Amino acid sequence: PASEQETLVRPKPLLLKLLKSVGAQKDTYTMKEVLFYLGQYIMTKRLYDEKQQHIVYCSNDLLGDLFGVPSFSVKEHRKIYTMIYRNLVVVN
Ligand SMILES: COc1ccc(C2=N[C@@H](c3ccc(Cl)cc3)[C@@H](c3ccc(Cl)cc3)N2C(=O)N2CCNC(=O)C2)c(OC(C)C)c1
Numbered sequence: 001p002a003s004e005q006e007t008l009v010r011p012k013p014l015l016l017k018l019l020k021s022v023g024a025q026k027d028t029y030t031m032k033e034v035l036f037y038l039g040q041y042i043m044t045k046r047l048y049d050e051k052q053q054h055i056v057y058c059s060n061d062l063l064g065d066l067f068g069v070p071s072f073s074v075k076e077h078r079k080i081y082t083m084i085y086r087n088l089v090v091v092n
């Protein structure tokens with residue numbers, strides 16, 4: 001592959017369940033794809049605050065079970081990446 005910065009990942013089963021609900025089923029995804037799909041899952045389910053759309057409340061949604069937090073701001077990039085990595089493996 002041309003892009004040295006790309007990340008290929010294999011989601012854990014429950015992350016795969018989430019991704020399949022919003023997107024295509026694949027063996028391997030890229031990290032940028034996973035980020036995009038997670039955001040669109042949030043949009044599709046309206047997990048954000050309508051009057052503060054950069055805040056997400058996900059407790060007891062599948063997303064909250066995966067991330068292990070009840071809520072987060074989309075500005076919290078370290079948190080979002082680290083939680084995502086806790087839900088997949090990077091491909092060798
Ligand atoms: C002012 O309101 C905003 C501002 C930015 C984001 C956002 N920001 C993008 C983003 C966030 C964090 C990282 Cl680490 C990377 C990208 C991306 C995203 C990706 C993954 C997750 Cl878990 C959540 C959001 N993401 C989005 O998914 N957005 C923005 C672009 N188009 C959309 O339809 C939704 C946003 O997300 C909602 C889904 C809550 C809302």
Ligand SMILES: [Cl-]
Pocket residue numbers: 035036039
């Ligand atoms: Cl994105």
